[PDB]
Design a protein around this ligand. Sequence first.
Ligand SMILES: N=C(N)NCCC[C@H](NC(=O)C(=O)[C@@H](CC1CCCCC1)NC(=O)OCc1ccccc1)C(=O)N[C@@H](CCC(=O)O)C(=O)N[C@@H](CC1CCCCC1)C(=O)O
Lengths: 70, 107, 107, 1023, 214, 107
Amino acid sequence: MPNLLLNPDIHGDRIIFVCCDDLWEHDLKSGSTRKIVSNLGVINNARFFPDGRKIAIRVMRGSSLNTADL
Amino acid sequence: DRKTVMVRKDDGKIYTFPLEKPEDERTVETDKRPLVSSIHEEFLQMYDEAWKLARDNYWNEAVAKEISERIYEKYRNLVPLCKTRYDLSNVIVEMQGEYRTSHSYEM
Amino acid sequence: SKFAEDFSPLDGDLIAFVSRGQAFIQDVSGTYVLKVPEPLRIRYVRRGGDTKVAFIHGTREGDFLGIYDYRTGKAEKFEENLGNVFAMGVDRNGKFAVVANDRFEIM
Amino acid sequence: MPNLLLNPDIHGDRIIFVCCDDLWEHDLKSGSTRKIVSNLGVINNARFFPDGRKIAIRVMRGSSLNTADLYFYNGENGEIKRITYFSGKSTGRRMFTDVAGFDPDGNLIISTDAMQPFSSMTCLYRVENDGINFVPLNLGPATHILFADGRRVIGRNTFELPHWKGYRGGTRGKIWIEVNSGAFKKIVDMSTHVSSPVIVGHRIYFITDIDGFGQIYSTDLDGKDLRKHTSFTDYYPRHLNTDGRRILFSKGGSIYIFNPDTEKIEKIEIGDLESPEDRIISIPSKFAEDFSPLDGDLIAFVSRGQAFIQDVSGTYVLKVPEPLRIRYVRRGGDTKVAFIHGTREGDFLGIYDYRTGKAEKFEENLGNVFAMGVDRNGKFAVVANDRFEIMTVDLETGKPTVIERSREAMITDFTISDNSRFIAYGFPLKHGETDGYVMQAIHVYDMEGRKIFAATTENSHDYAPAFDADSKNLYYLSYRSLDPSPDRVVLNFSFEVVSKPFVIPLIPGSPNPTKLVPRSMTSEAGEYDLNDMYKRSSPINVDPGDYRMIIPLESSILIYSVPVHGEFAAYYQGAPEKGVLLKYDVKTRKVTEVKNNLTDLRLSADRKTVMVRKDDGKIYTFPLEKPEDERTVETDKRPLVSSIHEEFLQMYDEAWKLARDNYWNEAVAKEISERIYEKYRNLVPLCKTRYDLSNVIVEMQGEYRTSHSYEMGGTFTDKDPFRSGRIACDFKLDGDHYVVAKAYAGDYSNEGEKSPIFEYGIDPTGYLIEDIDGETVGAGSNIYRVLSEKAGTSARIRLSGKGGDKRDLMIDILDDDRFIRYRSWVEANRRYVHERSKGTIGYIHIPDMGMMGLNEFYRLFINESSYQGLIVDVRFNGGGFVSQLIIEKLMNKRIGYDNPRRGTLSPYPTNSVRGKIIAITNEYAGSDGDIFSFSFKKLGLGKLIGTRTWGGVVGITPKRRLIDGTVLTQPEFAFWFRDAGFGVENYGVDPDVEIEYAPHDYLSGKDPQIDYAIDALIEELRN
Amino acid sequence: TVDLETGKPTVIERSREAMITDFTISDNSRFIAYGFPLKHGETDGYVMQAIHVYDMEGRKIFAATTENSHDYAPAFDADSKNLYYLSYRSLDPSPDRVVLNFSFEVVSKPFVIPLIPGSPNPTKLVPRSMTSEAGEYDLNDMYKRSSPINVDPGDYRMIIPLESSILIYSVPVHGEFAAYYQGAPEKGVLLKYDVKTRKVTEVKNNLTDLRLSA
Amino acid sequence: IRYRSWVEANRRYVHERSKGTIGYIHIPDMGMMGLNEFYRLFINESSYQGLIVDVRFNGGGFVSQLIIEKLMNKRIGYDNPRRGTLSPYPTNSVRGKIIAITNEYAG
Ligand SMILES: N=C(N)NCCC[C@H](NC(=O)C(=O)[C@@H](CC1CCCCC1)NC(=O)OCc1ccccc1)C(=O)N[C@@H](CCC(=O)O)C(=O)N[C@@H](CC1CCCCC1)C(=O)O
């Protein structure tokens, strides 16, 4: 069985998205996917900066995800 | 037998004391044995209930019968793709939105 | 403890309770714990005899009354649909049970 | 900055390795790296299956990584799954329960001691159905298993030994190989340690430092044609692994590739991979220590190198403004506090004022401080160091002044009179240079006159000195009230309750106040005179016992008492000693209990505030006047804030400094330390996790090329330890039902020595296990996982024996069953020896030389000592320090008997072996294990049978921890044998008759060592 | 056993090491438990003691405990369904405060043996509804069903089983000087163990001897 | 008091006359007192070049074997600490030569 992917962002051929609450990156060219950040809590939004280098991330914490920070 | 008393105090713990001698209360412990379950079976269970509640409690009984039966299968097929609680939430909320009405929350 | 509910006192200074859809028969200490042998969603558990306990098993179709004996092991499960049960009790003589549902019925 | 990579494995162009405790994969072709598995805990080993698809992984859990288990990763669907629920015990140097290798059919073969009596018994098992069933290979303990041309290659103790470079002891790595299609032959047994074996073509590649440094070697399937392939000099290479074509390994934090055909080595370029948040949060209580009461009902304490001034509530907390390592904090004034700041150079005294903010920090080096106090008037402080000195540091100038220096131990037990004129302290001393015991005498230093006076004589142990408010008497304790207490099992006696309080009036002619001598009938008013004061000593009428502290008050005396107890939990589990606060009314002479369940106590300056630690581990504070009103000290309100890299640099420097300052040979230290410091310090910044830092520290400890350089404790993960459900049984998957293959039991009448099932009056052996807690187990349900999930409680278990024998019991699911397995094993060997020797030989086994060894030795000695012969089996003996006590008993020669009118003969001595004794020992007996083996030979008590022992005999007694709680050990006590010097170190003891225990011996199910012992003794029992 | 009517004695068993002075009779007068001194070898240095149980019916002796230490102070419960006793088997060394030495000071612990196989250790508090007793007497291989009672080790001289508590005579560790010369009596105390609360308390102190009625 | 004074007196005498090369110990009997007096000095006199084990007037008892056991121990090693003095192995081992004194009052 596959996963549930969501909330993506693009920058050229690179595509970051959320899977299993963690942040992943996929290369349109090579076709390879990898988890770039995890164990931070529940990530629902990731945004590529202009230079496509850094990434602003939103993560939720607390049993019911009542709190969040960047 | 009106002899045993089981209570819950403000500290959240459960206690039990004989009605005759309320001085001798004991603390109920339940975290000795772990709780064992399967994510996918629970998720399927939870989905079906969320879906059943949405239909059984919608203000308009008529519309429910049609709305429920029309969205059930579509969203149930995504449950197995859910590995985390948040995933399941994404599926459940989308199916709640199907009632095109306010106050369909998840807390 | 995190998902526990419906804590209730049984015969022989025993405890029954529900958590995450599962049900258990344990001593206050939580050292001797028995899991009721029944699929997901056991809404309620109620003292029904020296070693017998009645319970409400929930499914997608509705709620049903079930009985279990933590001594012999037997655990029949009726088919008569009761609707959505929200309250359940058993007489002291263990012959019948009183149930309330979302249909506003008492039976 | 880059990361610290390690423990790789290869499969074609794909290379998996460990980084930041997680598992990563790198493609040689594309050059891309990615984390394939994380948040499982600490991963130290990952092994590619044959098809290169699945991956067997070893992960450690529990704060100190005391537990481990195995997981399967499938790169096809990203599936992760736990395979073992053994909860194998592991330590830094014995990371047992790991992957051993793969059989020809592509099945995983693991190595674990989970179902064995001894940890060293890492037996081989074939994993089946993802962990449903385990089939034993009965090849004996093994670390690696390789297959060449249908032949079985076996690696014994072939894991890396970073902590001990140049190891040449009996437990060194060795490789055996199959030849007779069922027989094995030892083929690689060099003088030094051999590790990480692999096969490429028809050669076995491995690592060893036979030449003074770690290099890769290889030989043919005969251990012949030795070749050296590498010439590294920077760091030791480790973790060899291969795919059949190329060899992979790590070194100095980088991964390299070795091509056997080209003999060329290259470094893989991976670059930066992960750099987690540096600023971290910690729970002050977890690393707290040195809790102390200040003025105005305030509290001071130290945690993780930091110091704080807070109210009991922990609501108003002040952090002392000082860099890393604040060893101690002490009340120095209304709002001032003195502290000991530690650095790489040493420890220094510092003062701080939590009101004004000022915080000067002296430069005068005090050495390594271990005790620190301040006078009540806040002018000077008394300090003790590892140089055995006691001194007074001026709180104004900073200038230290040594009062006296001991040549035996530290002067940490001292006190200052309230008028700041006298300083009393325990002074360790010895009558002779080679004396067996260290005495202690109280000394009193007079600030005026600056002369030291003797408070007590030097014939025993006097301690816990204390002055009274008026400064007119000096009270103290001593173990001088000798009275023997009888041993309930063995003919023996010891001094259990011989502690008694004494007092010494500082003014001659003044009587002992507790004596209640009418004032009108005495003529004091004299003047101070400390001369010949040990002659005026007087006891205080309080029954003997075991007192640790004496506090004189107006009309009563407070005494801290510790009831006699066993030492087992304290020696292993580290359990704290339980004491109680007693009160002695001078008037009524009656004694009462003021507080119990104490494990530590501290008194304020004004003698009014009491701060204690109870058995629950919490700190409390109550006024001495009304002990009924105690409050709980909370410190976890405010988080602990620190920087990983700054702490890591701090921790490294300390580990390095301790290793040098405590090495037994001072000379060698200066050279070794300065030579390895920089090299390993440059890797610290590559460490992002605790485990990383550990890898660096351990490697630098190995640089001392000596035994006993360990690392225990510390926080490596926030993951809870793996759990395992045990009922002392062996399960065998037969068909679709699990059957009870074996039911362990030793002495049925003892405690905790049999499967909990036995209590229901039936032997589970042969029975079938239907279900557990209503859930069915068998071909589909993993019984281990189930059991693991019930560990610590009683679950209903449906059993089925022969016929219609149906059982339904509430069995206790144990968290561990090692001891039961052990006792079962001993009782088994006992029976065997009795039967084979036709009832003429006894058997005893000493698991170690600590409290357990004492237990096990006497447990049987009392019943086996009177046979014609005796086998003292010390195999797997983990050491300790009671070997001399054991030799002493075996040394006793029976020279007489007692003839009773009625009854049987009674031998003299009672603790005398009746006949001939033979000792069995293997490569798993070390330290005091080595000592015992060597001594048994030297004293000629009998013949020594087995295999050369471990070879590590440089004692260790740690006395300092790392800010994270880590407890490092340093070989500080070099054992010197007469006519052998330190020769035993890094070598072990050779048995008179060598008897290997080859892999085929295990296949046959015969113990060649115990058998030789029996037979040999039978022959000696013909005369 | 001497017949109180006829006067005829009947020897049950004979030890070859010491006297069999530590015994008790079940309330239903069917069983006789006692400490039996024994030695593995003729020239053995230590004398072990195993509890034996003689059955008036069948007239056969059964082994209550193994013979590897010292088991004593046997005692039956009112219903005559369990046999409680003490033993110095809980080995744990206590450190000598003066000389490098260790000895067994507090290694005494209580144990029980259910006379009906399958019946669990009562002090364990195993729910009746979760057990299936009602079995019949069977003293064979009873030393295998032995079970400890969760009471901290020490130096116990007597164990008295009651309805919902156990009385235990404890003797605190002390010096032997006065006892060896002056002949001073040993100081003990009567402890109570509540089976339910598992809590221990002091019923009486300053004792030097104790006897219980029928 | 008279007894201990006598022992300490002989102790001083032996130290002085042997120029500090011989230790002294005296066993009043072989019971509890003997155990006390023997270890009371053994711990400080055992490490001299020589040792005098005086057993004159020894009234007996039953712990002789325990005493012989200690005197039997042969010193075959030492412990070298980075800081501190040597520690003999065994600890309870006499360092050198031992001589026993006895009279007609030991039985
Ligand atoms: N106090 C404690 N709670 N623990 C201390 C026990 C540590 C121990 N070592 C040994 O038995 C040594 O033989 C010794 C021997 C010597 C040598 C010279 C002087 C004095 C003692 N003893 C020792 O280290 O300790 C005490 C000591 C120290 C200074 C002065 C006087 C006594 C030892 O750990 N041994 C190895 C032996 C391995 C082998 O036999 O090959 C071991 O790894 N044992 C366990 C793991 C443990 C267990 C407990 C602690 C640490 C590590 C194993 O995996 O088998």
